[PDB]
């Protein structure tokens, strides 16, 4: 009448799924497979609710997932209802909190997000928001006195902190993560069978 | 630059998860772990959307899941909105369609569900519905001329086709399934590590 070790077995099988899906979510992300990334995130989110305690590595995983689903919605402005903040703004918050080295790349990804968070609003044609976003990210004299000039003039076109340079830098970061967890149980075992 | 075999790897890892969760969903079900069964079903449903094609064994799995989440909501009458039918009514439909032998047990489980589907409404105190349900399940002269007498008299108490006899028979069936898929990859491997 096995019991309790079963519960513990599930946790191991849970953590496996969590890393397998984080890996999946990453590939779809780099490979730009929209209707897929969404599908994997549903499973991630569902599997994640299935956990009430987490290791340091796992929290790292979860946040990377949260982080990527956010920027994955960047240009999607009704934004996320639970918090009246914009997706990239929320991605900015997670980024500067994930337990990770602040390399040169980290800083690059942070300024792209910071800036693009304004540009996206400017694109959607919502400059009243573009200003609101700008307010929340700046406002305490990081190029600022300049940016207020853009929102003001709806001068929506002139810096190399482009949306695509942002995705690139983020995709390049996903590759480290992507590799670091490619030998993770579930997937490694999965390929073995595909032979 | 691995590619495509990766997609195929995921499908194998998908089918693994699907059976692992079906197994999980079963234990929680037999062991009556409400806030858990719900959690596992979320993951099942999420993982299931992650599949666009399915083997015969897999469809068997899915339906058993669908089947159990339904009776798991039996006494829950607003019922499921997408279809203006009651949960047990819907569980009755799946049951008589799962690719499985119609043993003595099968027939038992079918008459319990059939009857309880009326009794639940009678319990919730909704006899107008109790009649509607009765209409949809009967009405073409299977104890019937009798049952219309109960709904009429709100004589809500007097047969051994009890709700609990229903859960028992269903729980006993879950044990075959439960066993048949206990050596399924994921879980077996999971326990090995728990040692």
From Swiss-Prot, chains A, B:
The modification Phosphoserine is found at residue 149. Residues 1-195 are annotated as: TRFH mediates dimerization. It is found in: Nucleus; Cytoplasm, Cytoskeleton, Spindle; Chromosome, Telomere. Phosphorylated preferentially on Ser-149 in an ATM-dependent manner in response to ionizing DNA damage. ADP-ribosylation by TNKS1 or TNKS2 diminishes its ability to bind to telomeric DNA. There is a cross-link at residue 143 (Glycyl lysine isopeptide (Lys-Gly) (interchain with G-Cter in SUMO2)). Changing residue 16 to P: Abolishes telomere binding. Changing residue 54 to R: Loss of interaction with FBXO4. Induction: Expression is tightly regulated during the cell cycle; levels are low in G1 and S phase and increase during G2 phase and mitosis. Highly expressed and ubiquitous. Isoform Pin2 predominates. Binds the telomeric double-stranded 5'-TTAGGG-3' repeat and negatively regulates telomere length. Involved in the regulation of the mitotic spindle. Component of the shelterin complex (telosome) that is involved in the regulation of telomere length and protection. Shelterin associates with arrays of double-stranded 5'-TTAGGG-3' repeats added by telomerase and protects chromosome ends; without its protective activity, telomeres are no longer hidden from the DNA damage surveillance and chromosome ends are inappropriately processed by DNA repair pathways. The acidic N-terminal domain binds to the ankyrin repeats of TNKS1 and TNKS2. The C-terminal domain binds microtubules. The TRFH dimerization region mediates the interaction with TINF2. Homodimer; can contain both isoforms. Found in a complex with POT1; TINF2 and TNKS1. Interacts with ATM, TINF2, TNKS1, TNKS2, PINX1, NEK2 and MAPRE1. Component of the shelterin complex (telosome) composed of TERF1, TERF2, TINF2, TERF2IP ACD and POT1. Interacts with RLIM (via N-terminus). Interacts with FBXO4. Interaction with TINF2 protects against interaction with FBXO4 and subsequent polyubiquitination and proteasomal degradation. Interacts with GNL3L; this interaction promotes homodimerization. Interacts with TIN2. Interacts with RTEL1. This is Telomeric repeat-binding factor 1. It comes from Homo sapiens. The chain holds residues 62 to 265 of 439 of the full protein.
